[PDB]
Amino acid sequence: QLTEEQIAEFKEAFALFDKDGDGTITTKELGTVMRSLGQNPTEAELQDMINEVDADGNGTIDFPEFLSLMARKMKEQDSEEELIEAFKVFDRDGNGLISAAELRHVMTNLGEKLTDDEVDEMIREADIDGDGHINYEEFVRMMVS
Please state the residue numbers annotated as binding site for Ca(2+): 18, 20, 22, 24, 29, 54, 56, 58, 60, 65, 91, 93, 95, 102, 127, 129, 131, 133, 138
- For residue 43, state whether it binds Ca ion (rule: CB under 5 A): no
Q: Are 128 and 137 in contact (CB under 8 A)?
A: yes
- For residue 129, state whether it binds Ca ion (rule: CB under 5 A): yes
Q: Are 107 and 55 in contact (CB under 8 A)?
A: no
Please state, in angstroms and rounded to a whole number, the distance separating the CA atoms of residues 111 and 104.
11
User: Residue 53 CB, nearest distance to Ca ion (Å)?
Assistant: 8
Tell me how crowded residue 97 is: count the other CB atoms within 10 A of its CB: 17
Site string for Ca ion, 50-89 (x = CB under 5 A): ----x-x-x-------------------------------
Q: Are 88 and 94 in contact (CB under 8 A)?
A: yes
Q: Are 32 and 18 in contact (CB under 8 A)?
A: no
Question: Nearer Cβ to Ca ion, position 52 or 118?
Answer: 52
Question: Nearer Cβ to Ca ion, position 78 or 94?
Answer: 94
